[PDB]
Write an enzyme that holds these catalytic residues in place. Structure first.
Site, PDB file in Angstrom:
ATOM      1  N   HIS A 254      65.293  13.169  38.036  1.00  0.00           N
ATOM      2  CA  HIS A 254      65.394  13.631  39.900  1.00  0.00           C
ATOM      3  C   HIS A 254      65.827  12.188  40.439  1.00  0.00           C
ATOM      4  O   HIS A 254      64.847  11.726  41.636  1.00  0.00           O
ATOM      5  CB  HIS A 254      64.043  13.717  40.405  1.00  0.00           C
ATOM      6  CG  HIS A 254      64.075  15.658  39.593  1.00  0.00           C
ATOM      7  ND1 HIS A 254      62.754  15.134  37.987  1.00  0.00           N
ATOM      8  CD2 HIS A 254      63.625  16.641  39.398  1.00  0.00           C
ATOM      9  CE1 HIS A 254      62.846  16.875  37.811  1.00  0.00           C
ATOM     10  NE2 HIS A 254      62.970  17.333  38.972  1.00  0.00           N
TER      11      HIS A 254
ATOM     12  N   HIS B 230      71.529  13.076  40.318  1.00  0.00           N
ATOM     13  CA  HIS B 230      71.009  14.286  40.072  1.00  0.00           C
ATOM     14  C   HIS B 230      71.445  15.111  42.254  1.00  0.00           C
ATOM     15  O   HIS B 230      72.201  16.297  41.974  1.00  0.00           O
ATOM     16  CB  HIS B 230      69.541  14.630  39.806  1.00  0.00           C
ATOM     17  CG  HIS B 230      69.041  15.591  40.212  1.00  0.00           C
ATOM     18  ND1 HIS B 230      69.728  17.179  39.300  1.00  0.00           N
ATOM     19  CD2 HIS B 230      68.196  16.655  41.054  1.00  0.00           C
ATOM     20  CE1 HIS B 230      69.051  18.263  39.867  1.00  0.00           C
ATOM     21  NE2 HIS B 230      68.334  17.548  40.828  1.00  0.00           N
TER      22      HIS B 230
ATOM     23  N   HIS C  60      67.443  17.063  48.360  1.00  0.00           N
ATOM     24  CA  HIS C  60      66.475  18.405  47.908  1.00  0.00           C
ATOM     25  C   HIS C  60      65.857  17.897  46.809  1.00  0.00           C
ATOM     26  O   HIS C  60      64.627  18.158  47.185  1.00  0.00           O
ATOM     27  CB  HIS C  60      67.244  19.353  46.944  1.00  0.00           C
ATOM     28  CG  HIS C  60      67.768  19.510  45.570  1.00  0.00           C
ATOM     29  ND1 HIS C  60      68.872  18.400  45.656  1.00  0.00           N
ATOM     30  CD2 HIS C  60      67.099  19.748  44.251  1.00  0.00           C
ATOM     31  CE1 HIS C  60      68.647  17.952  44.932  1.00  0.00           C
ATOM     32  NE2 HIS C  60      67.744  19.059  43.769  1.00  0.00           N
ATOM     33  N   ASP C  61      65.618  16.506  46.902  1.00  0.00           N
ATOM     34  CA  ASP C  61      64.766  16.023  46.127  1.00  0.00           C
ATOM     35  C   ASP C  61      63.823  14.570  46.502  1.00  0.00           C
ATOM     36  O   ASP C  61      63.992  13.480  45.465  1.00  0.00           O
ATOM     37  CB  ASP C  61      65.531  15.925  44.424  1.00  0.00           C
ATOM     38  CG  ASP C  61      64.746  17.187  43.417  1.00  0.00           C
ATOM     39  OD1 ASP C  61      63.988  17.742  43.178  1.00  0.00           O
ATOM     40  OD2 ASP C  61      65.336  17.044  42.080  1.00  0.00           O
TER      41      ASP C  61
ATOM     42  N   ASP D 217      70.823  23.555  41.329  1.00  0.00           N
ATOM     43  CA  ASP D 217      69.571  21.864  40.540  1.00  0.00           C
ATOM     44  C   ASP D 217      69.230  22.279  39.067  1.00  0.00           C
ATOM     45  O   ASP D 217      69.177  21.327  38.814  1.00  0.00           O
ATOM     46  CB  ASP D 217      68.034  23.039  41.435  1.00  0.00           C
ATOM     47  CG  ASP D 217      67.305  21.661  41.103  1.00  0.00           C
ATOM     48  OD1 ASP D 217      67.977  20.709  41.460  1.00  0.00           O
ATOM     49  OD2 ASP D 217      66.281  22.462  41.630  1.00  0.00           O
TER      50      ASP D 217
ATOM     51  N   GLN E 234      64.404  23.880  24.352  1.00  0.00           N
ATOM     52  CA  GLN E 234      65.682  24.250  25.145  1.00  0.00           C
ATOM     53  C   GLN E 234      66.598  25.996  25.140  1.00  0.00           C
ATOM     54  O   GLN E 234      66.365  27.039  25.761  1.00  0.00           O
ATOM     55  CB  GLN E 234      66.682  23.671  24.317  1.00  0.00           C
ATOM     56  CG  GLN E 234      66.892  21.806  25.355  1.00  0.00           C
ATOM     57  CD  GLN E 234      66.977  22.532  26.650  1.00  0.00           C
ATOM     58  OE1 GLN E 234      67.825  22.984  27.649  1.00  0.00           O
ATOM     59  NE2 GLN E 234      65.726  21.603  27.382  1.00  0.00           N
TER      60      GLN E 234
END
Ligand SMILES: Cc1cc(NC(=O)c2cc3c(COc4ccccn4)nn(-c4ccccc4)c3s2)n(C(C)(C)C)n1
Ligand SMILES: [Mg+2]
Ligand SMILES: [Zn+2]
Length: 313
Positions: A68, A72, A106-107, A217, A269
């Site tokens: 993050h 990213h 956004h992060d 995202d 996953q």
């Protein structure tokens, strides 16, 4: 007015593709972001000196965490760029402006811990905001930087328009809370099926922008397999660190976050592609047909994780 950004030939071509990787040279990422804003928006929409100052303050407020991080942020913004360029007539000038900024921001100030961990830790942010805790923190970090001197990239908007674009940015950043994705995709699925989906209804637009934000995202699952596979190491490095922090509070972490259960990763996953990623890009492709390559590249990676499980790599 006459100062346009160029990329080397390979980047100028590959940046238009959904599966672009921004590469390991940090010092090129700002110039990549400006190029994307100039081609998505126009060379006019932002004053270059304010934009550049804004970008470097945003970078400064991303932390040195495994996933993050600043890479990213630019990666998520590049996916949004790919969507906007492939759906050129669907979005207002304000939306094009706001959504690329939303993705970069956004992060902001992420420390690599989920909303769940803040709540169990009893972090002050969890008292300030009971739901979408980090996401309301990410938005208030965005407003903070927009209010620094020389950083108002929206300076030439009216009071009215400024308020609209900050409202697009808030809803977009809040929508990156994956807890909210499930119901949002369910509602859009229903609206698309019964044919009630209407892009002139502002509350329908908001949902479609919400799903685009999820799609951007998660876009690690839509790269070529060697990129998807290396990025998965970074994601799990954060998950396992959080699992360690759970154990320190006296709480057995969910097995996804337990570094003692790394053997369960490939099946984890497989679970995530079936439950989250495939439905996300499926519904997105129904609403925005030119995003099809994201769905295709997601199915390819699902197939690659099945090969890992079956001992074929
Ligand atoms: C509401 C909500 C939702 C989630 N979980 C998540 O947000 C994610 C999970 C995963 C996995 C692996 O998932 C699974 C699923 C089941 C069992 C094992 N593992 N891969 N990626 C990923 C992969 C590639 C790119 C980005 C993210 C993500 S993002 N939480 C927690 C509590 C934070 C976990 N709370
Ligand atoms: Mg986030
Ligand atoms: Zn993110």
């Amino acid at each position: 007015g006459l100062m346009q950004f160029t990329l080397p030939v390979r980047l100028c071509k590959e940046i238009e593709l959904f599966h672009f990787d921004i590469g390991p040279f940090e010092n090129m990422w700002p110039g990549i972001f400006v190029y994307m804003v100039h081609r998505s928006c126009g060379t006019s929409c932002f004053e270059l000196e304010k934009l550049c100052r804004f970008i470097m303050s945003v970078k400064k407020n991303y932390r040195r965490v495994p996933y993050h991080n600043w890479k990213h942020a630019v990666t998520v913004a590049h996916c949004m760029y790919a969507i906007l360029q492939n759906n050129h007539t669907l979005f207002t000038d304000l939306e094009r402006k706001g959504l690329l900024i939303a993705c970069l921001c956004h992060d902001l100030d992420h420390r690599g811990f989920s909303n769940s961990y803040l709540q169990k830790f009893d972090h002050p942010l969890a008292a300030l905001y009971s739901t979408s805790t980090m996401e309301q923190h990410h938005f208030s970090q965005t407003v903070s930087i927009l209010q620094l001197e020389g950083h108002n990239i929206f300076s030439t908007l009216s009071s009215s328009e400024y308020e609209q674009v900050l409202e697009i940015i808030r809803k977009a950043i809040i929508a990156t809370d994956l807890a909210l994705y499930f119901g949002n995709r369910k509602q859009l699925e229903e609206m698309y099926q019964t044919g009630s989906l209407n892009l002139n209804n502002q509350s329908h637009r908001d949902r479609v922008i919400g799903l685009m934000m999820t799609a951007c995202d998660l876009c690690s699952v839509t790269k070529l397999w060697p990129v998807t596979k290396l990025t998965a190491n970074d994601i799990y490095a954060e998950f396992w660190a959080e699992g360690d922090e759970m154990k320190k509070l006296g709480i057995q972490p969910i097995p996804m976050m337990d570094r003692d259960k790394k053997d369960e990763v490939p099946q984890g996953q497989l679970g995530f592609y079936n439950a989250v990623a495939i439905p996300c890009y499926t519904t997105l492709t129904q609403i925005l047909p030119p995003t099809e390559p994201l769905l295709k590249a997601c199915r390819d990676n699902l197939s690659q994780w099945e090969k890992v499980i079956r001992g074929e790599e």
